[PDB]
């Protein structure tokens, strides 16, 4: 809501504001008390001034008393100015840290009940919502709202205190010259709300078109091998750069309209002086002003009323914030109907295993004018196996998902011994069901911690056993780091069924009642099914399993089969039962570090930006060098009264000074907007192309890199948005003010030294001093940054984890676990967060203590000078007013430099990560191009070992052959290698030892994208996009426009047009991320269609048809069979009725071939294609 920002921040943080508060009051209402004390030291001052008049008369003692009083006052005030001084920096620290200790206790409790409220949504709320976006709102959108309400809303408190003690300090000091500079007030107030507003709107626009960014930087980057293969670099290229420029205009705008309101700002302040030195002839009048008066009334209005508009930052900090804190609190606010977190619930003590489906009718939210399933009826009794069979797209899965209660059937009963699931509590649900998917899915961790996924609370023994009843203790006994090996993101760096036989064990460690299995064994050759079949048949009668394949081995011995035919049991009996039925079974059962100068680096990027960084270092440099020229004019119009004589002589006449103001005014905007657009600009066009060649370098690198443990597409995504972040906030102001206050400084140097040399060596003294309190912060929060950074990019692997691997994550209840993970990991800059707080709060205080301390030592220095006729008012003003202020200006240039550290902390990487050349280079052009491609694939002596295992071995000399129209199939057993070489004819890898030809050249000379483009390459898990379903398929050609007659075409050779026709929206369907929104057989046939679509010379097939069912798969390979010559075609299948009619069919175990011949030739010998026959009938 509006005031609803503050609901988590208890009785230590409604403290933290109150006191902050009082304090920010306090410190505020010091401005107005200076004012006081300063004009009646001016008035005070000046009695002495203007000794000129009779200075020929010489009571001696008289001047003496004159000065020695003079001294006797001055004494007094610097004692006030040294109080004030004294007791600002209590409340100022009270002021910054309380504030930040507010916010951040509560940005903190935000970001941990956000996830927790993420993690809480139903499945159906992450299949309507683009979840790719989530992770960037956690980290950049909380951002938001942690800078709007931390210390900018404490300096907010101490503008209106310093607009309220202008009012009190003018109305006691003045009846009618407040009034006269109130005139602008109300003006600079819409002003704040009116740039305020349009800021926050451009600021939420802008905040979503980075997300865009960051949700297409992440759907590339987690499909990185398809975007390889397909050779799609260019245009995921330009849809980044698509978001990169609505962005940056949007960017441009933004700099273009805050420099212009801050113009105006300063064009008011101009207007404000010279109209206040306007009716400045009430001194002329006696005792109608005093001088000192009228400079303490108009320093306090002028102080207050654009400390109000100063604010309006502050306020459009706090607007921002507002502008992103409703997602941030929408997605809180919204409360699932299955709420797993929910305690409410029955906990049955004894449970059978009785599954009862009564009229199930459900649509998917997404597609909600399909009906999946019309009347589904199913019994399911204790101690049974029950086998469903049917279609691709019949519904399984979704039987599957209903039975773990994932989504609410639309009308109908799922039921465990006969209760409603709806009564039972969702999480005790969950925990006696243990499910493997139809393409399990593993985190980046070990394989230890991923089987510990499914009881967190298991210990090593049980572990093991359960890898014994999964087949899989052989391989992880086999390879180095056994159980601690990392397996990659998604459990990329493991075989298929590698990776399926470690997520049965994760569902075997749980020990479940009701054991979902999908398709559990289609990536498992015929003896690691054997040995998983038996080993689930020997504790067969603990538990009921809900079994669903394609696949007739496994469907022989289930007790019962159900078969599905458009979302209806058509068919429930055993084996034998439904041999006689004659129905679709039976036709199923026919058919089978960082260098100092990497910020310069970067600003050497903007060469082509030279007009606008020399235009405006001109521009910054005359901005700059007036400054101390606004001194100079002030000091004037003091000394035209404080030493002017005779009211003819001057006052009146002396009102050239006022023009003068006006004409600075002008040159405010003729400078300062040029000063901050030209800089405001190019760092919009700056970051834009960082952004764009540290997105181009990463899609440029090798699939080697992206293996490496760090580089994951959580830690991507976070390492792209938050480098150029940093590059960003360093650039622009933070880098005008550098080539300004360097001048505001210098160009005091010269003129206050040719009026008052005495006094300007306090400055040799003060910015010393100054400076020394940026080290002391810089020195003691110097590598914080780098573990800001790191950790940074850690808690933004969980979240990626968890977030994109939400379903499975939700099957395992594991929930909790990712939440205590995030939270680990958000611990350390938590405290870095708060350890921060008080150091920029000392700093603060400190900074702003030494104006007022400052003001003491410079005036009653001053006035000793004045006592030995050395110095009047006007040099002592003058001086002090340059210098001071030059030493306040590079105060903020040290206060700031914690930004430019951070800067070059992101500029070294992003320079690091962009000069990177891959070792296969992709966009290199150099490399041979054949006119004429033969088809002939070759690979002598191959071998290879992956990079993250470079000891284990994987191929050790593999030699085959491959000719156009000969149709080679690749068999073995799990991990021998079948998909390695399909990697190494892509070149994915490069072959340490052997040589991989193609037509008789080796590949490695051919050019790298035309090899890959004759490449049709079908991976062993096939991932789509989060597009349609034709900008899937027209993926297979990037160098062309595909028409939509091929796209058809593509898809009626995949057998998967009539889905989509049969589809609503056609082939504009949107599919979910990965592909989520489509059964196995769907996406695996939609990445058929898209391979065909390329008519490719080389058809790479890694079990193609793995989740396609026989028709399908028949369809498929009559297709196929259709264009048999003319390309030539490698596929690897489990299956042994797709590798019955290769040309050749090799066994690949253990990286070498063994069994060589056609299929005749191989059965006839007694062997390993022998041995797989045998078991599979
Ligand atoms: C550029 C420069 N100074 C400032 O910019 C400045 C910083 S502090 C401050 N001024 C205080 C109130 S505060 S001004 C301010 C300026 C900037 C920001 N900000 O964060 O954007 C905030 C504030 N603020 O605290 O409200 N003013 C004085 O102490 C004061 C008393 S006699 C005097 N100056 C001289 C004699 N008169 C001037 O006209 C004059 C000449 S050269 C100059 N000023
Ligand atoms: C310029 C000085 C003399 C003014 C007075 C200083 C105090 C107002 C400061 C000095 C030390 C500060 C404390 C230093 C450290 C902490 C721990 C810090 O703990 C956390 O990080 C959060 C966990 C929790 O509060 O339990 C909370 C603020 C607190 C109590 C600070 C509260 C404010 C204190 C008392
Ligand atoms: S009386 C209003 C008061 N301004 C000054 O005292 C003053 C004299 S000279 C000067 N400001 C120069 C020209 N301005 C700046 O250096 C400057 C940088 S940013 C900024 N002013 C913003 C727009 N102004 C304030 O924050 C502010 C509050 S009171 C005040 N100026
Ligand atoms: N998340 C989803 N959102 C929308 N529709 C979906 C979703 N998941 C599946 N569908 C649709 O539901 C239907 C059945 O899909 P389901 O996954 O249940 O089939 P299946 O029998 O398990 O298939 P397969 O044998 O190919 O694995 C299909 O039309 C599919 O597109
Ligand atoms: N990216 C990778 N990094 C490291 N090791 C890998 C990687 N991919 C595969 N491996 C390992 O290489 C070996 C062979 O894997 P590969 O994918 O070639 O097997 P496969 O024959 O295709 O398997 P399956 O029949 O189960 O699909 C296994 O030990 C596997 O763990
Ligand atoms: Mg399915
Ligand atoms: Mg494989």
């Known amino acids: 809501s509006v005031l609803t920002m503050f609901r988590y921040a208890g009785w230590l943080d409604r403290l933290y504001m109150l006191v902050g508060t009082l304090a920010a009051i306090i410190h505020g209402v010091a401005l107005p008390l200076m004012m006081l004390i300063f004009g009646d030291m001016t008035d005070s001052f000046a009695s002495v001034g203007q000794v000129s008049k009779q200075s020929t008369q010489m009571s001696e003692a008289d001047k003496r008393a004159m000065f020695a009083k003079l001294e006797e006052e001055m004494t007094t005030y610097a004692y006030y100015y040294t109080g004030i001084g004294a007791g600002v920096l209590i409340v100022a620290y009270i002021q910054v840290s309380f504030w930040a200790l507010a916010a951040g206790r509560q940005i903190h409790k935000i970001r941990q009940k956000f996830f927790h409220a993420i993690m809480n949504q139903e499945i159906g709320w992450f299949d309507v919502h683009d979840v790719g976006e989530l992770n960037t709102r956690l980290t950049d959108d909380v951002s938001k709202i942690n800078e709007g309400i931390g210390d900018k809303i404490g300096m907010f408190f101490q503008a209106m205190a310093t607009f309220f003690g202008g009012f009190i300090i003018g109305f006691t000091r003045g009846w009618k010259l407040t009034l006269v500079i109130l005139a602008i007030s109300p003006v600079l107030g819409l002003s704040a709300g009116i740039w305020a507003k349009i800021l926050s709107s451009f600021t939420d626009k802008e905040l979503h078109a980075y997300a865009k960014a960051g949700a297409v930087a992440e759907e590339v980057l987690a499909a990185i091998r398809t975007v390889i293969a397909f050779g799609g670099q260019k245009k995921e290229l330009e849809r980044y750069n698509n978001n990169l420029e609505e962005a940056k205009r949007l960017g441009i705008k933004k700099a273009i309209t805050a420099n212009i309101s801050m113009g105006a700002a300063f064009l008011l302040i101009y207007a404000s002086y010279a109209l206040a030195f ?142 409603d699931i709806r009564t039972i509590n969702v999480r005790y649900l969950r925990e006696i069901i243990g499910v493997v998917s139809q393409e399990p899915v593993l985190f980046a961790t070990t394989i230890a911690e991923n089987i510990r996924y499914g009881r967190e609370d298991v210990t090593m023994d049980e572990i093991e056993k359960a890898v014994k009843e999964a087949n899989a203790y052989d391989f992880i006994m086999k390879l180095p780091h056994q159980f601690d090996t990392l397996v990659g993101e998604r459990g990329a760096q493991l075989s298929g069924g590698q990776k399926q036989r470690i997520a049965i064990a994760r569902a075997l460690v749980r020990n479940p009642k009701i054991l979902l299995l999908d398709e559990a064994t289609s990536a498992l050759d015929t003896e690691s099914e054997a040995v998983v079949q038996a080993a689930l048949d020997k504790a067969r009668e603990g538990r009921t399993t809900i079994v669903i394949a394609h696949r007739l081995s496994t469907v022989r011995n289930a007790d019962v089969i159900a078969g599905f035919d458009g979302g209806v049991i058509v068919e429930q009996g055993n084996h034998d039962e439904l041999m006689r039925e004659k129905g679709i079974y039976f036709k199923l059962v026919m058919t089978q570090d960082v260098p100092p100068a990497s910020f310069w680096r970067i600003l050497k990027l903007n060469s082509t930006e030279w007009p606008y960084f020399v235009v405006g270092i001109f521009a910054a440099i005359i901005n700059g060098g007036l400054q101390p020229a606004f001194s100079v004019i002030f000091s004037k119009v003091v000394g035209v009264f404080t030493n002017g004589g005779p009211p003819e002589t001057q006052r009146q006449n002396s009102n050239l000074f006022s023009l003068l103001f006006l004409i600075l005014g002008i040159i405010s905007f003729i400078t300062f907007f040029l000063q901050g657009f030209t800089f405001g600009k190019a760092g919009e066009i700056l970051t834009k192309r960082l952004r764009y060649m540290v997105f181009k370098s990463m899609l440029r690198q090798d699939v080697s890199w992206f293996d490496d443990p760090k580089n994951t597409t959580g830690a991507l995504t976070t390492r792209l948005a938050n480098d150029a972040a940093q590059v960003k906030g360093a650039t622009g102001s933070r880098l005008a003010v550098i080539f300004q206050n360097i001048a505001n400084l210098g160009t005091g140097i010269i003129i206050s030294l040719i009026y008052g040399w005495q006094l300007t060596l306090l400055l040799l003294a003060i910015v010393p001093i100054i400076a020394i309190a940026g080290v002391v912060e810089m020195k003691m929060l110097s590598g914080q940054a780098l573990k800001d950074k790191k950790e940074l990019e850690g808690s933004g692997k969980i979240a990626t984890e968890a977030i994109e691997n939400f379903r499975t994550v939700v099957s395992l209840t594991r929930e909790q676990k990712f939440e205590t993970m ?33 003001y ?165 898990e096939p991932i789509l996009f989060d597009r349609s379903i034709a900008e899937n398929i027209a993926y297979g050609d990037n160098s062309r426009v595909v028409s939509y007659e091929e796209i058809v075409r593509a898809a009626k050779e995949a057998n998967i047009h009539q889905f989509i026709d049969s589809l609503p929206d056609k082939y504009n369907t949107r599919v979910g991320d990965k592909g989520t929104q489509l059964s196995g057989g769907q996406k695996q046939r939609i990445a058929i269609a898209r391979a065909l679509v390329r008519q490719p010379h080389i058809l790479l097939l890694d079990e193609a048809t793995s989740a396609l069912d026989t028709e399908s798969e028949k369809v498929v390979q009559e297709a196929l069979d259709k264009a048999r010559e003319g390309r030539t075609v490698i596929v690897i299948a489990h299956r042994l009725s797709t590798i019955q009619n290769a040309d050749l069919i090799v066994v690949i175990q253990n990286g070498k071939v063994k069994e060589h011949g056609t299929h005749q030739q191989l059965l006839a010998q007694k062997g390993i294609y022998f041995s797989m026959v045998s078991v599979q009938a």
């Open 278 to 419: 306007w009716y400045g002839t009430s001194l002329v009048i006696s005792k109608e002003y005093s001088i000192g008066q009228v400079l303490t009334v108009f320093f306090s209005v002028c102080i207050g009323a654009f400390s109000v508009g100063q604010a309006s930052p502050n306020i459009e900090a706090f607007a921002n914030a507002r502008g992103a804190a409703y997602e941030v609190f929408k997605i809180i606010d919204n409360k699932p109907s299955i709420d797993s977190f929910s305690k409410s619930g029955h906990k049955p003590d004894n449970i059978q295993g009785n599954l009862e489906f009564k009229n199930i009718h459900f649509s998917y939210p997404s597609r909600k004018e399909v009906q999946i399933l019309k009347g589904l009826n199913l019994k399911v009794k204790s101690g049974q196996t029950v086998a469903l069979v049917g279609n691709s797209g019949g519904g399984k899965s979704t039987t599957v998902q209903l039975m773990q209660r994932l989504y609410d059937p639309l009308d109908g009963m799922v039921s465990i011994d006969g209760q």
């Open 822 to 854: 995030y939270a680990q990991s958000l611990q350390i800059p938590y405290r870095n967060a708060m350890k921060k707080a008080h150091v920029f709060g000392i700093t603060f205080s400190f900074t702003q203590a030494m104006m007022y301390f400052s």
């Open 856 to 1020: 003491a030592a410079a005036f009653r220095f001053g006035a000793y000078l004045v006592t030995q006729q050395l110095m009047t008012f006007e040099n002592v003003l003058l001086v002090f007013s340059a210098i001071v202020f030059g030493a306040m200006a590079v105060g903020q240039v040290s206060s700031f430099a914690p930004d430019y550290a951070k800067a070059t902390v992101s500029a070294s990487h992003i320079i690091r990560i962009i000069e990177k050349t891959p070792e296969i280079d992709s966009y290199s052009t150099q490399g041979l191009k054949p006119n004429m491609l033969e088809g002939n694939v070759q690979f002598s002596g191959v071998v290879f070992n992956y990079p993250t295992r470079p000891s284990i071995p994987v191929l050790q000399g593999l030699s085959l052959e491959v000719k156009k129209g000969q149709t080679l199939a690749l068999v073995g057993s799990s991990g021998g290698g079948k998909s390695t070489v399909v990697q190494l004819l892509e070149r994915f890898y490069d072959p340490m030892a052997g040589s991989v030809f193609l037509d008789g050249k080796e590949i490695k000379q051919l050019n790298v994208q035309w090899l890959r483009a004759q490449l049709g390459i079908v991976s062993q």
